[PDB]
Curated annotation (Swiss-Prot):
The modification N6-acetyllysine is found at residue 6. It comes from Homo sapiens. PROSITE patterns: PROTEIN_KINASE_ATP, PROTEIN_KINASE_DOM, PROTEIN_KINASE_ST. Gene3D superfamilies: Phosphorylase Kinase, domain 1, Transferase(Phosphotransferase) domain 1. InterPro entries: CDK, Kinase-like_dom_sf, Prot_kinase_dom, Protein_kinase_ATP_BS, Ser/Thr_kinase_AS. The record marks 9, 84-85, 162 as: CDK7 binding. The keyword rRNA-binding does not apply. The modification Phosphotyrosine is found at residues 15, 19. The modification N-acetylmethionine is found at residue 1. Belongs to the protein kinase superfamily. CMGC Ser/Thr protein kinase family. CDC2/CDKX subfamily. This is Cyclin-dependent kinase 2.
């Protein structure tokens, strides 16, 4: 739009490229997401528009949705840093535990809010988790999946990450729930603690087999109905489960306990965002300040 001046390519999401822009009028700076051209589906517009109402302290506010020349522009509140970069910058030392815990608690609140309104993210990842100098962390691109859909190949000619995708999605379940966001957050939680991706799969089956190698191949005992999933193959190699003490050290037992409940195979046994908030892991939760470099 003519009311925005692109300052820099802040990223390239699934539905489109994201830019840091300057409203030539208001003078406010925002992150402008342009989504590519038959005229854009009406259903999407109406769905995306509803998102303008779901406002929460831990959800990146969607200021306006601009649909001109039959193109889509999502105007979001701008934040100075994503979790990915912050992590890379913390690589040598690592993010302090008090901060990791504050971030998880805030993300969980955001999720609780979204899940209570029957809205899920479906594609949580370090790249759409934004932080500010205030010690707050926010979820970006919420509800955009129900608007369109994330494939395995992107227009940016790059590659879609499956590292945080819940097993029910990889196994073909087409009617997944809020539980998929909990799984992703769990994978992110573990990544913050170890400074290494939990399940860095390079393909769908490679992704599924890395999960299996660590948590063990799911069966009807631990996941009733798993063998009935569309893509479940009786020929899946049978891997034994591995202790969480080796999965995410030196995370304390409360943290390990919580992560374990966030990583349960059965979506129904997977702890909810609301319940996660009552976990003893957050008994001593605080809100530290990140040492950000901008
Ligand atoms: C994918 C994304 N989708 C949305 C809606 C994003 C967003 C929203 C608000 N601020 C920022 N800020 C921001 C993003 C990246 C960086 N980098 C330095 C990579 C700095 C600030 N990013 S990111």
């Amino acid at each position: 739009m003519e009311n925005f001046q692109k300052v820099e390519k802040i990223g390239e999401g699934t539905y489109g490229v994201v830019y840091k822009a300057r409203n030539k009028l208001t003078g406010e700076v925002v992150a402008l997401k342009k989504i590519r051209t038959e005229g854009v589906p009406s259903t999407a517009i109406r769905e995306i528009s509803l998102l303008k109402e779901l406002n929460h302290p831990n959800i990146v506010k969607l200021l306006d949705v601009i649909h001109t020349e039959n193109k889509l522009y999502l105007v979001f509140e701008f934040l100075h840093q994503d979790l990915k970069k912050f992590m890379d910058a913390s690589a040598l030392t690592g993010i302090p535990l008090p901060l990791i815990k504050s971030y998880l608690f805030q993300l969980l609140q955001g999720l609780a809010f979204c899940h209570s309104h029957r809205v899920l993210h479906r594609d949580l990842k370090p790249q759409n988790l934004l932080i500010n100098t205030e010690g707050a962390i926010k979820l970006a691109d919420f509800g955009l999946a129900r608007a369109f859909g994330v494939p395995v190949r992107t227009y940016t000619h790059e590659v879609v990450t499956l590292w945080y995708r819940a097993p029910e999605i990889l196994l073909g379940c087409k009617y997944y729930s809020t539980a998929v966001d909990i799984w992703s957050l769990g994978c992110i939680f573990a990544e913050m603690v170890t400074r290494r991706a939990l399940f860095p799969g390079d393909s769908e089956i490679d992704q599924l087999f890395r999960i299996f190698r660590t948590l063990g191949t799911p069966d009807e005992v631990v996941w009733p109905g798993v063998t009935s999933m569309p893509d479940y193959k009786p020929s899946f190699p049978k891997w034994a489960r591995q202790d969480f003490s080796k999965v995410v050290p030196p995370l304390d037992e409360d943290g390990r306990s919580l992560l374990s409940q966030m990583l349960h195979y059965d979506p129904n046994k997977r702890i909810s965002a609301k319940a996660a908030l009552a976990h003893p892991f957050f008994q001593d939760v605080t809100k530290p300040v990140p040492h950000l470099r901008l």
